[PDB]
Design a protein around this nucleic acid. Sequence first.
RNA 1: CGGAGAGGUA
Lengths: 1316, 200, 50, 251, 66, 50
Amino acid sequence: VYSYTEKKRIRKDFGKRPQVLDVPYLLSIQLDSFQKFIEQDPEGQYGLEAAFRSVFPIQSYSGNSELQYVSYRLGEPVFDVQECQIRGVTYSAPLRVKLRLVIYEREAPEGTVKDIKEQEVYMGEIPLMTDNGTFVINGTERVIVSQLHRSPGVFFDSDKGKTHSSGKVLYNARIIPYRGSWLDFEFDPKDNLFVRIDRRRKLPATIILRALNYTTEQILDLFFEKVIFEIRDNKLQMELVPERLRGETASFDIEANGKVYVEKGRRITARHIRQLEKDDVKLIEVPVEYIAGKVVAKDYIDESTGELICAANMELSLDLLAKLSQSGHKRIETLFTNDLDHGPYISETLRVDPTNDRLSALVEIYRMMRPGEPPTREAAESLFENLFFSEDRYDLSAVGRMKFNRSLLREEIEGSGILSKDDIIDVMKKLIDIRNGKGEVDDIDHLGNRRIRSVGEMAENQFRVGLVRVERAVKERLSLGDLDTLMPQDMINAKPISAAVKEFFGSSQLSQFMDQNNPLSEITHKRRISALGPGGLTRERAGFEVRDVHPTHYGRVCPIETPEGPNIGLINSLSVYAQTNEYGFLETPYRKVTDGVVTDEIHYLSAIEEGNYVIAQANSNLDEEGHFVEDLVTCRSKGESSLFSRDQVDYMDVSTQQVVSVGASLIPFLEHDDANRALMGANMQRQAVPTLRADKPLVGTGMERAVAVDSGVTAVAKRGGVVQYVDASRIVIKVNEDEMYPGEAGIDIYNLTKYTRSNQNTCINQMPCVSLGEPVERGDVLADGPSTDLGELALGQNMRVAFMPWNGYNFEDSILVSERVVQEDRFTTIHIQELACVSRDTKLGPEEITADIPNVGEAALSKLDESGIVYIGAEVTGGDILVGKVTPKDSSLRVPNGVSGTVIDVQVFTRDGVEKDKRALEIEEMQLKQAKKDLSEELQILEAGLFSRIRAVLVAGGVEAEKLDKLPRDRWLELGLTDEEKQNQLEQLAEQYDELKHEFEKKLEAKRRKITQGDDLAPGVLKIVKVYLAVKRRIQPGDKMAGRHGNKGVISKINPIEDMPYDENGTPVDIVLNPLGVPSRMNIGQILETHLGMAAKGIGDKINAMLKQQQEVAKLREFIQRAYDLGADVRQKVDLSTFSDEEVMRLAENLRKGMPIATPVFDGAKEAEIKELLKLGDLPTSGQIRLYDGRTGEQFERPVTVGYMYMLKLNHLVDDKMHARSTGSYSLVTQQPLGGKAQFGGQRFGEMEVWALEAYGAAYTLQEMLTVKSDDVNGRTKMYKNIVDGNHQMEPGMPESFNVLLKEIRSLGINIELED
Amino acid sequence: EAILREILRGGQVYYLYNDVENIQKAAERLAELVPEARIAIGHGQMRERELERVMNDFHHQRFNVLVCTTIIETGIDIPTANTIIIERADHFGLAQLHQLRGRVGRSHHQAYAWLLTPHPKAMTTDAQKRLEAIASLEDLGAGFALATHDLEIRGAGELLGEEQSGSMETIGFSLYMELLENAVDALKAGREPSLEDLTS
Amino acid sequence: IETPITANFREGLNVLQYFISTHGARKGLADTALKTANSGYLTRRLVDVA
Amino acid sequence: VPLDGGRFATSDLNDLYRRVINRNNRLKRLLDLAAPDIIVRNEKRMLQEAVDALLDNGRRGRAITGSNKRPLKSLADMIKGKQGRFRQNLLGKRVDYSGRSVITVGPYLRLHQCGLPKKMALELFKPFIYGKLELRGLATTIKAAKKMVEREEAVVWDILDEVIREHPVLLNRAPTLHRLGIQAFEPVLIEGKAIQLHPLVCAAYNADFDGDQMAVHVPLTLEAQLEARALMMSTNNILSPANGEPIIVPS
Amino acid sequence: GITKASLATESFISAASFQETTRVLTEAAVAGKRDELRGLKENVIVGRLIPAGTGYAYHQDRMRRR
Amino acid sequence: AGGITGEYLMLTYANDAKLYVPVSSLHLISRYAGGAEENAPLHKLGGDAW
RNA sequence: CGGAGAGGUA
Ligand SMILES: [Mg+2]
């Protein structure tokens, strides 16, 4: 029931909702998408197989040989990921594919084979995602974020009324195919439906109508309703449907069957239509003006002379009807036109259309498509037939057809990848309906319209782009003759594939450097949802419509966690339970609500299907059956929330924390914060620095273990068993006898990563948490990585805080930090920097790194060896020498000015062929010794495991306690044992030990070769040396530290212990925050966390009291049981009677520093539970205590809040930020000082700061800040001399960057000069 | 339509396939496309007697269309041949394209010179530049302009060496004149015989 | 929205009311960012006319 | 300029001038040859196009391209816009004797003085220290004084307390919106790394203490120090210019 | 408006260091204009004293000298 | 071979570059004439053309 | 002290 890592320290879980679906693997998007990329696909629709079947088989141009594809297989990486990070080479795998080349013999007719060759050709190096989600491209670990772009399909958008200023909205429709030419219909303010293709010239839409072989008659039949007139004995009798008169005004006496139904001047009432239906009317006598404006449907030819009376789509009139009736025409068909319901948007376009048939329509489409090129028949018909109806030059994807048929109210979400006739007709009908108001436009930022294009899809796209170039090269090379001598690999070059996959993985707008100063920062950078990138919107041209959180974001995208600043909401982050659909849309889990019972079946609803049903709220109280306790529950119907009946609901939310991300699910009491402060809390919790010793949060949200385990920072056991040898650098696990495999049993080894350097220059180092001789299970955390404590996220330290103003040292947002905080060595963080020195190949000979340099004392060469490289472990300070280098005529790598630290790792690279120096050689000798020690220690530990299993199976069938030790372990086969299956098992294990012996003799030489192999470097250099400094940046006034609820602030004083406000017991407060930051920034969650942390440390202090004095295990057991009780019907329910009286003494050993508390995000601990838990300890249940002053020794009246707030130290130090400059380098084209801190640069006194001096009277100060201090070199040298000579006086002169301007205008045809 | 334009006029067609292995196929492919033609092949790897056999058949109009490689670059020009069709104008020297474009005519019959190219994405960028270079400057006296545009496309090769038409960064014109006058002085000075002359 | 968030910050906020509060805050933040971008050019235009 | 790898930077103006010179030399030779009119006409056309590309590229639609599918930076492209000479290198420019650091509170200060770290104060006022060390006779050159300041003996802190004494520095925040965004302040030397800022002026600076950084400029001449003390000192800006009401309100 | 009233200034530097530099340079180079350095911006460009504060007395002296 | 079925002879030359020839063209195949059916060498297909 | 791209602080 409890894993052994979770029996060490059981986090007391508050919260009352029983969870029905565990959190998924938090990196499911990256891992599952890329395993959708590289996997053998028998169905052949995903990844590399789909690309190969899409391109191959390829025909030669002469049509005599095709090159076809059989199967593919990923090879093995020549380097491991640690070595890839060390050497600076891509972690890639070879792509070995079996192409098959046929040859057709010229004698026999088309289709015959002479010879058919088939070999495995090497093409490309595709990088492999590591077992976390991160690629290694050049040793810089890059993460590829998913993209949120428009799904190909049909979009009915509109202007809101923002063109041509008449207030008319212009409803437009647009077909966006996945691959092909776009189409879009739009309106003109003259109510004309026009067509255009790929934003070319704008044609009448009836041209595209005719081009599909539609006559005018078919157009009017499809796009309009008919009205039947009949000339008879009196008047033009006309057949009428009752509903046709809705919303018109009566213009005559509407009379039928001798009954005057409607009088003129009346709006046709609902009663009119009802009485017309009741009286069973069909026919109306209409006057002659009721045809005088209406328009005929069909062209009417003479029944005798065969001549056309009225053209198609022509308005009837008086004499027109007379000539129609004198030709014996009895039936008249008319367009059911309106002004509000069925407008004449097609007829007017037919009138403005200058084209009368299909062929001239195709010619018009040609002349719009291609200027020039006088069209023919076959050219135009071919262009139109392959413009939208070719499977190869136009293709909606399967997602494209899905969106197309879904948005057009169809049912078949499968179909052809091309357009058709009825598709375009349905689009046109939908656009006309939207103009009529029936049907509505589609908002673009709806998550049913936006699609997740993850790493698998983008890499497959770039690989297909790489393949199509190889396709052309193979095509032309096969077109080249003499094909019998050649082979696959000769025509097909690997370079296009590798180049076009490397320009994606290396330098793309979405393959970005990994934020790697946390476990949380990694695991929430691998789930970002960028709206930018190729095929997406631009960063600085995104309106407020995109940046708002749409009501579809619930459950799919976190609404709070997003960066603030220039891109708010463009870089959204995924929610906890959200997944990607089979088409790419974001779907979220829900519980299916049956007749009245909330069941436990989980339906993943997408963003479109959600709008039809109604979904309950995450916390709507049901009691033990799935029946809601309330008969009016809060629900979400369609992009909007309401109050619904207890039987009307369809779905419940899965868990109370499905709205938020993983970065904002670790904020306790999130339901009490604001959303601005929750945004700031998530965005700064993403920045915390892993401190020296990790310290658990006393108030978590129970999500800490998921974040620690799911990210790859911890070292977690693959198979359970018993630990056999724990070092600070490795962990050996002897497997249990049941999970272990039959052949090559062995025991598992976890080589922990020691003090290596993260991407953000922080220290990541796994350290073991399991002691020797200790059982572990499958999924048990063995080693805690950077900022983890016993396998749960511990980003910062939990600190005793008091909320009061203290002499203004915490004035605005500042923090007053006790000196006990820096004494206890808790916020001091390691920072590892990497300095590289290069040995260029240059004129007058390359550079030698040997120690001999001129104009140096021996103190500058005290630490460097004979070879010119500083020893490992030598404390350097700013200005020292790490690697001495010479100018061929002091080009040494010096420590930058200001940084201390210890040199902890020196690595040397060298091109193959260049001889190495003595310290270089000893580095490879230690590397050979280390690799041989690793392989040989692996070999002998595996020998011990194999022989331990050999002795374990020897218990039955040939047991020999003393005979087995008469000969050594090697000859453990030919002893006394009956020739049965057990001897076969002994043969298996011993012959596989022999296999391990062979593995030694090859693997050792392979590693020896790898160590002595020269490494590829960029041309120009010879040898590269990298020195790794380790600094311990502790804390000082200035280091910006924050909390979890968005309460940032630099610290303003390191106050000594006795000055700190101490309580009635004598314990000094460690941090004095400010109360004034709580009301105006409504983050009440920090006060609630302060109280809960006070309660937790009270419980931990009581356990520490019962442990410091020795008390029997019954007392501790009873108190811990009381503590794990007292929730208001919580779901934790841990029972201590199953604990074996030893693990209680370890549980209460881990609980002596405060009893950790879980507060799930929106189902947290109420106030009553906090008061009760404070009451269990001997603390005052009001949260606040009386707190004595430190200096005056008297009492702070108005008793103040103390507690245990969990504070982080962010990565905005003050050693990084402080900078100053008197005189240094100067820029070249313009003699202004350089800019930056890396460059020794001066601050920019910009435009606004110049206005800030013009607004004063400071003319002289301004004059020197833009002539003397900066720009006039003849002025600044003399100013330096004057300052040194004690005389403060400027001779200003003329700024040089105005002479630069003068020359750059004078170098045009403009004479600009200075007068007298 | 180009082939029937030249045939029903009464003149031969220079079909330029520029390949030896596939030209045999292209013969019957063109024959199937154009039944109204009398097609035969001639290329440089024929036995050099059948080649002149085909040429002396071609002077006497016994067959219209001659699918042929660039042996006609030398040209044996007849009066009736008046339409050259390049099958792959993608890869050809610009000088070669102009020269073959000059192989037709020599009569009062208005000639044509089609330059069939592959898909505009398929051809290389230098192939593109050659194609607008030949398409644009089309008039009388375009021989010099085409070579002038060929320069700065390929770049003048190294001045003092072999290997015309290369974009190399070798010695400039200023240094070359200096070397030449220095050589003139050192030669005219002391009695120094010529290099190649002492090769005698 | 016709249903106001009926709970203060001392009591909790359930999921839906927090979603609506999140919308309001995101609108405020985006408006602040692009508003600063708009105001800088305005004060530049006034400075270089007076 | 070189990119350290045996090559040189592009410097697009050189490419445009090279095109113009090439075309002009071609035209000169063609005029010396009495060439036919069509070829010299084409060469004069392409010369005119080269001149239009050099003077103002991008006024024509076909912007000339050197690499990266990127239009070249012409002569007129070095003047217009945010990155031209006028707005980037002339109106506002980078300055010597300047520094930048995170700010904290320090509420013991008086209204006219601000904290200043010892390292920053030694680094801005380095020429003043050199002058005083040559005056005291402790280093009879600039090199020995430079070594002394680089070593930080216990005499240079006395020299600082002699040269800080009544020498205002200008504190500045990043979005300097109004004229109370640059204010003079007498320095007090601090054994820290943050610029302590008297908390009455955080209303004028709009400066919360949650990670803001401020820049320290140093007025050199006597006119500038007197301008700072008489116009820009914090004890003179207690009434805002936008309204008569105070701006040093207890916050 | 402040845009057009800033561009239609009598001093072409005060209208060229504002937006739309190239049109100001052409229109003020054809007409052969002259800039007398009156505003507080062109003196910033050419790096002499501001004629507002402590530099106002200096500019008064320079105006009375000629 | 493009929509037709066929039966062929698998020949594994050096480096396992497979070659097939149809059973119809069996007359392109001979037994090894060196008498070294347990000592025969293994050519590569077509040779090093490029 | 070239350019492009990606982030981040106020
Ligand atoms: Mg701030």
